[PDB]
Amino acid sequence: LKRKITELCDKYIRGPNIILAISAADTDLANSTALQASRRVDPRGERTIGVITKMDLVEPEKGAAILSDRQYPLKLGYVGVISKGNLLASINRNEKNYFGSHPTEFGPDSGVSTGVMTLRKKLLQVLEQQ
Amino acid sequence: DDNMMFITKKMIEIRNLLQKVGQGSTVTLPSIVVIGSQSSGKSSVLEAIVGHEFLPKGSNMITRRPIELTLVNDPEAKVDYGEFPDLGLARVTDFSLIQKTLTELNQSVTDDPIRLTIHSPNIPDLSLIDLPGYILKRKITELCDKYIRGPNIILAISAADTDLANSTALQASRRVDP
């Protein structure tokens, strides 16, 4: 939580590992924040991919702000997804289904990318390359 | 404590004067700074709304410019009117006109904060400033950090969702205020 745990994190992030940063979306007060340490150890944003989580519970305008930004660009892009027998298929069905509520906000031709499978493919590519 | 009310009023006045001599060109008096995560910041703007009366917030707000709200205890006046100091001597009766105006300032976007003054007998005189809630995004956090570091009475709101490491309003509150 705090940061002293920060010390371990920082050390691990430094070296040339492919860093997977996530960020909770929302915010009652002003709003939902964003990343920070990934940009601290990686100024170019070249070896870090971003995931925006808890994205079920924000207006779609909110997803657009977060999934797509240019104020904070990186290669490999961000990936927004809501995570929460046969649970696997289920979490897949929900992802397929949810964008329907606000398809225009995060769907085809929208810049943003989302759901677990596209993210998984990208992870495969970057891992293989590095 | 009517006299406490009055003394707070004179002190917010002298604060606004110090602000009118210029930014960084003088020392100022503290005030309430409000911060909130994405969900916590929608609840933030809505909270500020209900703290006095309905005023234009939310929708899609660029959040890039803070809003210095300076409130006045309003005896002797029976109409709910809010005015802009830059547009001096100009009063607004309905806050839908305030909606069109200050949301026009939103879509306009200097980093200067717009000052505001609202008079209502129901509202107690105050001095809160609303800056962007947390969601490049490092820039908004830079201005926020700059505002909270100085000994202002910080008002943190919460209704979040982020992991323990994610909830930004309270955790930054503890960052600058141990």
Coordinates of C-alpha atoms in Angstrom, one line a residue:
Chain A
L1 CA 0.0 0.0 0.0
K2 CA 2.2 2.8 1.3
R3 CA 5.6 2.9 -0.3
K4 CA 8.2 1.1 1.8
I5 CA 6.8 -1.7 0.0
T6 CA 7.6 0.9 -2.7
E7 CA 11.3 0.1 -2.3
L8 CA 10.9 -3.5 -3.4
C9 CA 8.7 -2.4 -6.2
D10 CA 11.1 0.2 -7.5
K11 CA 13.9 -2.2 -7.5
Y12 CA 12.0 -4.8 -9.5
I13 CA 10.7 -2.3 -12.0
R14 CA 14.0 -0.8 -12.8
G15 CA 15.7 -3.7 -14.6
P16 CA 14.6 -4.5 -18.2
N17 CA 11.5 -6.5 -17.4
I18 CA 8.3 -5.9 -19.3
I19 CA 6.3 -4.0 -16.7
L20 CA 2.5 -4.4 -16.5
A21 CA 0.9 -1.4 -14.8
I22 CA -2.7 -1.3 -13.9
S23 CA -4.8 1.6 -12.6
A24 CA -8.2 1.8 -10.9
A25 CA -10.6 4.0 -12.8
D26 CA -12.9 5.9 -10.6
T27 CA -13.1 8.6 -8.1
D28 CA -15.9 10.2 -5.9
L29 CA -13.9 13.3 -5.0
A30 CA -12.3 15.0 -8.0
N31 CA -12.0 11.7 -9.8
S32 CA -9.9 8.6 -10.8
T33 CA -6.2 9.2 -10.9
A34 CA -3.7 7.2 -13.1
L35 CA -0.3 5.6 -13.3
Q36 CA 3.0 7.2 -12.0
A37 CA 5.8 4.8 -11.2
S38 CA 5.9 3.2 -14.7
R39 CA 6.5 6.7 -16.0
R40 CA 9.1 7.2 -13.2
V41 CA 11.3 4.2 -14.2
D42 CA 10.4 4.3 -17.9
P43 CA 10.3 7.8 -19.4
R44 CA 9.9 6.7 -23.0
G45 CA 7.0 4.3 -22.0
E46 CA 8.6 1.8 -24.4
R47 CA 8.8 -1.3 -22.1
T48 CA 5.5 -0.8 -20.1
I49 CA 1.9 -1.6 -21.0
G50 CA -1.0 -0.2 -19.1
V51 CA -4.3 -1.7 -18.0
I52 CA -7.3 0.3 -16.7
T53 CA -9.3 -1.8 -14.2
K54 CA -12.5 -1.5 -12.3
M55 CA -13.9 0.1 -15.4
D56 CA -17.3 -1.1 -14.6
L57 CA -18.7 1.9 -12.7
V58 CA -17.7 5.0 -14.7
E59 CA -19.4 6.9 -17.4
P60 CA -18.0 5.9 -20.8
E61 CA -16.7 9.4 -21.3
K62 CA -14.5 8.3 -18.4
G63 CA -13.3 5.2 -20.3
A64 CA -12.4 7.4 -23.2
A65 CA -10.5 9.7 -21.1
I66 CA -8.6 6.9 -19.6
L67 CA -8.2 4.2 -22.2
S68 CA -7.1 6.8 -24.7
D69 CA -4.8 9.6 -23.8
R70 CA -2.1 11.4 -25.7
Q71 CA -1.1 13.4 -22.7
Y72 CA 0.5 10.2 -21.6
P73 CA 1.4 8.1 -24.5
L74 CA 3.4 4.8 -24.6
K75 CA 4.1 2.1 -27.1
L76 CA 2.0 -1.1 -26.7
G77 CA -0.9 1.1 -25.6
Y78 CA -3.4 0.8 -22.7
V79 CA -5.9 -2.0 -22.3
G80 CA -9.1 -1.4 -20.3
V81 CA -10.9 -4.4 -18.9
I82 CA -13.2 -5.2 -16.0
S83 CA -12.3 -8.3 -14.1
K84 CA -14.4 -10.0 -11.4
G85 CA -17.6 -23.3 -12.5
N86 CA -16.5 -22.1 -16.0
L87 CA -15.8 -18.7 -14.6
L88 CA -13.3 -18.0 -17.4
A89 CA -15.9 -18.2 -20.2
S90 CA -18.1 -16.1 -18.0
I91 CA -15.7 -13.3 -17.6
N92 CA -15.3 -13.5 -21.3
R93 CA -19.0 -13.3 -22.0
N94 CA -19.4 -10.2 -19.7
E95 CA -16.6 -8.4 -21.5
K96 CA -18.2 -9.2 -24.9
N97 CA -21.6 -8.0 -23.6
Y98 CA -20.8 -4.8 -21.5
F99 CA -19.4 -2.6 -24.3
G100 CA -22.8 -2.9 -25.8
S101 CA -24.3 -0.6 -23.2
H102 CA -22.0 2.2 -24.4
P103 CA -20.7 0.8 -27.7
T104 CA -19.9 4.2 -29.2
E105 CA -17.7 5.1 -26.2
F106 CA -15.5 2.0 -26.5
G107 CA -16.0 -0.1 -29.5
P108 CA -15.1 -0.4 -33.1
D109 CA -13.2 2.4 -34.7
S110 CA -12.9 3.9 -31.3
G111 CA -9.2 4.1 -30.6
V112 CA -9.4 2.2 -27.4
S113 CA -8.8 -1.5 -27.0
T114 CA -10.5 -3.8 -24.5
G115 CA -11.2 -7.2 -23.0
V116 CA -8.9 -9.9 -21.9
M117 CA -8.0 -11.7 -25.2
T118 CA -6.6 -8.8 -27.1
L119 CA -4.6 -8.0 -24.0
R120 CA -3.4 -11.6 -23.8
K121 CA -2.2 -11.6 -27.4
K122 CA -0.3 -8.4 -26.9
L123 CA 1.4 -9.8 -23.8
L124 CA 2.4 -12.8 -25.9
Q125 CA 4.0 -10.6 -28.5
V126 CA 5.9 -8.3 -26.2
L127 CA 7.2 -11.2 -24.1
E128 CA 8.4 -13.1 -27.1
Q129 CA 10.2 -10.0 -28.5
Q130 CA 12.0 -8.8 -25.3
Chain B
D1 CA -21.3 33.5 17.0
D2 CA -22.3 36.2 14.6
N3 CA -19.0 37.9 15.3
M4 CA -17.1 34.7 14.3
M5 CA -19.1 34.8 11.1
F6 CA -18.1 38.4 10.5
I7 CA -14.4 37.9 11.3
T8 CA -14.3 35.0 8.9
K9 CA -15.9 37.3 6.3
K10 CA -13.3 40.0 6.7
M11 CA -10.5 37.5 6.5
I12 CA -11.8 35.9 3.2
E13 CA -12.1 39.5 1.8
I14 CA -8.4 40.3 2.6
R15 CA -7.5 36.9 1.1
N16 CA -9.2 37.9 -2.2
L17 CA -7.3 41.2 -2.1
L18 CA -4.0 39.5 -1.6
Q19 CA -4.9 37.3 -4.6
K20 CA -5.6 40.5 -6.6
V21 CA -2.1 41.9 -6.0
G22 CA -0.9 38.9 -8.0
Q23 CA 0.2 35.2 -8.0
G24 CA 3.5 34.5 -6.4
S25 CA 3.8 38.2 -5.8
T26 CA 2.6 38.0 -2.2
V27 CA 1.8 35.6 0.6
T28 CA -1.9 34.6 0.9
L29 CA -4.2 33.1 3.5
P30 CA -5.2 29.4 3.6
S31 CA -8.4 28.0 2.3
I32 CA -10.2 24.7 1.7
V33 CA -8.7 22.6 -1.2
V34 CA -10.9 19.7 -2.4
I35 CA -9.5 16.6 -4.1
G36 CA -11.1 13.3 -5.3
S37 CA -10.6 10.2 -7.4
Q38 CA -12.6 9.8 -10.6
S39 CA -15.7 8.4 -8.8
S40 CA -14.7 10.3 -5.7
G41 CA -14.4 13.5 -7.8
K42 CA -17.8 13.2 -9.4
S43 CA -19.1 12.8 -5.8
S44 CA -16.8 15.8 -5.1
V45 CA -18.4 18.2 -7.5
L46 CA -21.9 16.9 -6.5
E47 CA -21.0 17.4 -2.9
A48 CA -19.8 21.0 -3.5
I49 CA -23.1 21.5 -5.3
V50 CA -25.3 20.4 -2.3
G51 CA -23.1 22.3 0.2
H52 CA -24.9 25.5 -0.7
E53 CA -27.3 25.2 -3.7
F54 CA -27.4 23.7 -7.2
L55 CA -24.7 25.2 -9.4
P56 CA -23.2 24.0 -12.7
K57 CA -20.7 21.1 -12.3
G58 CA -19.9 17.8 -13.8
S59 CA -21.0 16.8 -17.3
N60 CA -17.7 16.7 -19.2
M61 CA -15.4 19.1 -17.3
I62 CA -11.8 19.8 -18.5
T63 CA -10.9 20.4 -14.9
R64 CA -7.7 22.2 -16.1
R65 CA -8.5 25.4 -14.3
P66 CA -9.4 25.6 -10.5
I67 CA -12.4 27.5 -9.3
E68 CA -11.9 29.8 -6.3
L69 CA -15.3 29.8 -4.6
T70 CA -15.6 32.6 -2.1
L71 CA -18.9 32.6 -0.2
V72 CA -20.6 35.4 1.7
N73 CA -23.1 35.3 4.5
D74 CA -26.1 37.0 3.0
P75 CA -28.4 38.9 5.4
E76 CA -30.3 41.8 4.0
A77 CA -30.5 40.1 0.5
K78 CA -33.4 37.8 -0.3
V79 CA -32.4 36.7 -3.8
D80 CA -29.9 33.9 -4.6
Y81 CA -27.4 35.6 -6.8
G82 CA -23.8 34.8 -7.8
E83 CA -21.4 37.2 -9.5
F84 CA -18.0 37.1 -11.2
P85 CA -15.3 39.4 -9.9
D86 CA -13.6 39.9 -13.3
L87 CA -17.1 40.8 -14.7
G88 CA -17.5 43.2 -11.8
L89 CA -20.9 44.7 -10.9
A90 CA -22.5 42.0 -13.0
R91 CA -25.0 39.7 -11.1
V92 CA -26.6 36.5 -12.2
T93 CA -29.9 35.4 -10.8
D94 CA -30.4 31.9 -12.4
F95 CA -27.5 29.5 -12.2
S96 CA -28.3 28.2 -15.6
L97 CA -26.7 31.4 -17.0
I98 CA -23.8 30.6 -14.6
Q99 CA -23.9 27.1 -16.3
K100 CA -23.5 28.5 -19.8
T101 CA -20.8 31.0 -18.6
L102 CA -18.5 28.9 -16.5
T103 CA -18.9 25.9 -18.7
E104 CA -18.0 28.2 -21.6
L105 CA -14.9 28.9 -19.5
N106 CA -14.4 25.2 -19.1
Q107 CA -14.4 24.5 -22.8
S108 CA -12.2 27.6 -23.3
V109 CA -9.5 26.3 -20.8
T110 CA -2.8 29.8 -18.4
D111 CA -3.7 27.6 -15.4
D112 CA -5.3 30.7 -13.8
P113 CA -8.2 29.8 -11.5
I114 CA -11.5 31.5 -12.0
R115 CA -12.8 33.4 -9.0
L116 CA -16.4 33.3 -7.9
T117 CA -18.7 34.9 -5.3
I118 CA -22.2 33.7 -4.3
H119 CA -24.6 35.3 -1.8
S120 CA -27.3 33.3 -0.1
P121 CA -28.8 33.7 3.4
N122 CA -28.9 29.9 3.7
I123 CA -25.1 29.5 3.0
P124 CA -22.3 30.2 5.5
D125 CA -19.4 32.3 4.2
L126 CA -16.5 30.1 3.2
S127 CA -13.5 29.9 0.9
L128 CA -13.1 26.6 -1.0
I129 CA -11.3 26.0 -4.3
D130 CA -12.1 23.1 -6.6
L131 CA -9.1 21.8 -8.6
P132 CA -9.1 18.7 -11.0
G133 CA -9.9 15.4 -9.5
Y134 CA -7.4 12.6 -10.1
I135 CA -7.9 10.2 -13.0
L136 CA -0.3 13.8 -18.8
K137 CA -2.4 12.7 -15.9
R138 CA 0.9 13.4 -14.1
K139 CA 0.3 17.1 -15.0
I140 CA -3.0 17.3 -13.1
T141 CA -1.3 15.5 -10.2
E142 CA 1.5 18.1 -10.4
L143 CA -0.9 21.1 -10.0
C144 CA -2.8 19.2 -7.3
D145 CA 0.4 18.3 -5.3
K146 CA 1.5 22.0 -5.6
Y147 CA -1.8 23.1 -4.2
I148 CA -2.0 20.6 -1.3
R149 CA 1.6 20.9 -0.1
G150 CA 1.0 24.4 1.3
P151 CA -0.9 24.5 4.6
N152 CA -4.4 24.7 3.2
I153 CA -7.2 22.9 5.0
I154 CA -7.5 20.0 2.5
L155 CA -11.0 18.5 2.0
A156 CA -10.7 14.9 0.8
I157 CA -13.7 13.0 -0.5
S158 CA -14.0 9.3 -1.1
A159 CA -16.3 6.8 -2.9
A160 CA -13.5 5.1 -4.8
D161 CA -12.9 1.7 -6.4
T162 CA -9.1 1.6 -7.0
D163 CA -6.9 -1.0 -5.3
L164 CA -5.3 -0.1 -2.0
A165 CA -2.5 1.5 -3.9
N166 CA -5.0 3.3 -6.2
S167 CA -7.3 5.5 -4.1
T168 CA -5.8 8.9 -4.8
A169 CA -7.7 11.5 -2.7
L170 CA -7.0 10.1 0.8
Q171 CA -3.6 8.6 0.0
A172 CA -2.3 11.9 -1.4
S173 CA -3.9 13.6 1.7
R174 CA -1.7 11.4 3.8
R175 CA 1.2 11.9 1.4
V176 CA 1.4 15.7 2.1
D177 CA -0.2 15.4 5.6
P178 CA 1.3 12.6 7.7

